[PDB]
Amino acid sequence: GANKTVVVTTILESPYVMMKKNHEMLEGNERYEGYCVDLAAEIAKHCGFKYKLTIVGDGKYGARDADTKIWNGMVGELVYGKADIAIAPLTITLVREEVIDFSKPFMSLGISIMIKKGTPIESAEDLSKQTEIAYGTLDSGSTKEFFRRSKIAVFDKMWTYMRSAEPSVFVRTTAEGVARVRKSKGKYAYLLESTMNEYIEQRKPCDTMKVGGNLDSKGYGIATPKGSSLGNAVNLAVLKLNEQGLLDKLKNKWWYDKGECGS
């Protein structure tokens, strides 16, 4: 077939994809900036394709409903043919690998705890052993599924609390979770990936921090629908970019070089 513009699905999640300050006066890919915007340009160059960035319609990463077996989020967009590739902080997981393909990781990470400074919590075990401080995760993502599935004693205890907590402890976006931490006087802690936690630590008003070790070790990958003609070349491109130090340069650029909480 003739070369065709590749539809990239991605998600508005800082600092992966953000609206440029002057985005109103801009069009197409130029509306956006961030780690994954930089990454997409590199991947496309190396794989020889043109592309259009599109923000996922429902603003979700992607989960499958247990009853209907229907997928949402970026995973759904790939599964149902609405996008050709996902270039986003999308976690490589078993249930996703059953339906789509992933490159080798472009970033390594694990689940972690965000607190408002001063909150007397230093571990997941700490959270599990008390009830004064509420805690939750993002909806329709891999962190929620981690807790739902885990048989580890501490993590299952946390799930049991989170699933039946009222008012709901789950949030629709990472930014909503961060806002909740900031305004809840230390009575809400947020479970999120170390990458996002470390970024938010670097942002004003510098009132949050990561505590504890990571709960797991996993990775983000570039995802393609099964049968895509792009998967092999994308995988090799990710590995090249990692080996040439480009991925590390992009992390430093978006996380630390312009961190707002000092040197």
Ligand X SMILES: N[C@@H](CCC(=O)O)C(=O)O
Question: What is the residue-wise DSSP string for 53-78?
Answer: EEE-TT-----B-TTT--B-HHHHHH
Cα end-to-end span (Å), the chain: 51
Please, which residues have CB within 8 angstroms of residue 60's CB and are 6 or more apart in sequence?
Answer: 11, 72, 73, 74, 76, 139, 140, 141
89 is in an annotated binding site: yes
Output Rg (C-alpha) for the chain, integer angstroms: 19
Chosen residue from 16, 32, 49, 61 binding ligand X by CB under 6 A: 61
Q: Which of residues 109-138 bind ligand X (CB under 6 A)?
A: 138
- Indicate whether 99 belongs to the interface with a copy of itself (CB under 8 A): no
User: Residue 91: which of ligand X, a copy of itself, none does it interact with, CB under 5 to 8 A by kind?
Assistant: ligand X
**What is the residue type of 254?**
W
> What is the side-by-side strand order in the sheet with 134-136?
134-136, 188-193, 111-116, 208-211
Residue 259: count other Cβ atoms within 10 Å of its Cβ: 17
Q: What residues from 221 to 250 belong to the interface with a copy of itself (CB under 8 A)?
A: 221, 235-236, 239-240, 242-245, 247-248
To a copy of itself, the closest distance from the beta carbon of 86 in angstroms equals: 16
Q: Which of 42, 101, 126, 193 binds ligand X (CB under 6 A)?
A: 193
Q: Interface with ligand X includes 91 (CB under 6 A)?
A: yes
Which 130-189 positions form the footprint of ligand X (CB under 6 A)?
138, 141-143
- Asked if 215 is part of the footprint of ligand X (rule: CB under 6 A), the reply reads no
Q: Are 186 and 133 in contact (CB under 8 A)?
A: yes
Residue ranges of the binding site for L-glutamate: 89, 91, 96, 142-143, 193
| Contact residues for a copy of itself, defined by CB under 8 A | 92-94, 97-98, 102, 104-105, 107-108, 146, 149-152, 216-219, 221, 235-236, 239-240, 242-245, 247-248
